[PDB]
Amino acid sequence: SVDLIGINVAGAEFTGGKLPGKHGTHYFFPPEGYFEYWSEQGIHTVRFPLKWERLQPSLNAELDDVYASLVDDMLDQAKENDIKVILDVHNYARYRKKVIGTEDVPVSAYQDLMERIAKRWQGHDALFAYDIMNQPYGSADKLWPAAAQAGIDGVRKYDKKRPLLIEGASWSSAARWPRYADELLKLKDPADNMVFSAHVYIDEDASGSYKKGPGKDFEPMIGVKRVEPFVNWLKEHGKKGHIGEFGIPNDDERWLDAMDKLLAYLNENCIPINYWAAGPSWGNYKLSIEPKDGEKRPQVALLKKYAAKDNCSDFGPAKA
């Protein structure tokens, strides 16, 4: 099923400079009982960041036993709690800081990673989709379309059915999406099951850092206005879409109003969202919606309201 409302569950990609790092010290997978809470809240789709260097510390090599087994366990817990999982290679189109498509990181090495991910997990019922790369940006933008094709070809060697979530250049910006997405139109999927996934934050610079408050002339429609270029591109080209990241602070009604207006527009166009972020080890991080004693999470009420209004059977927007 295609749920319009989902959440990022972040933690396995934390402390990216510590490689391999130690589970429970530098990075964190869901503990036992984690998925039960979100399932009870009516949230059944999760986007799950993974760090490429931890899954595959040598290019072209077998996946790391320890880290890949933690993914096995998390997928098992998801299935036990009726959670659908989008695996996210959360790597900015880079491996050990080098862009996919340079001599350091050939596209064939990225294809190898995606083959191994699909080979290991295509048989797992909790796996819903592959978000093949988080936020290409900067020096990776030009080479990203060719890298995306290699990642698509990699998954399709072993999984010929599941959707592939294809992000865009410039941090997968929804607001700037049509400026760069021309070369994504040339991507070819033999299974014809690609879904484009953009990101949107509503601080001034759209980084999602929220260094300041809303500001005097804050526009409540800012979220809608920043996803319109993306949704209109989908309609113009007959494509399907998705929003892989959006989040807001908990400390101003203006943020919540903009979130409500955004969710209404996504609902009208059958565009799913993955809120950023839940996760087992966020502490007092400003964008965390994980429960924490004494910290309010008004964003969750909005996600629940729109989960009850989900009447879509597929990724939109519908061609009508």
Numbering used by the authors: 1 to 320
Task: Reproduce the article's own wording on this structure.
After the glycosylation step, the donor sugar is covalently bound to the enzyme within its negatively numbered subsites. Solving the structures of two RBcel1 variants, RBcel1_E135Q and RBcel1_Y201F, in complex with ligands has brought to light some of the molecular factors behind transglycosylation.
The kinetic parameters strongly indicate that both the glycosylation and deglycosylation steps are affected by the substitution of Glu135 with a glutamine residue. The side chain of the nucleophile Glu245 is positioned as described for RBcel1_WT in monomer A and the apo form of RBcel1_E135Q.
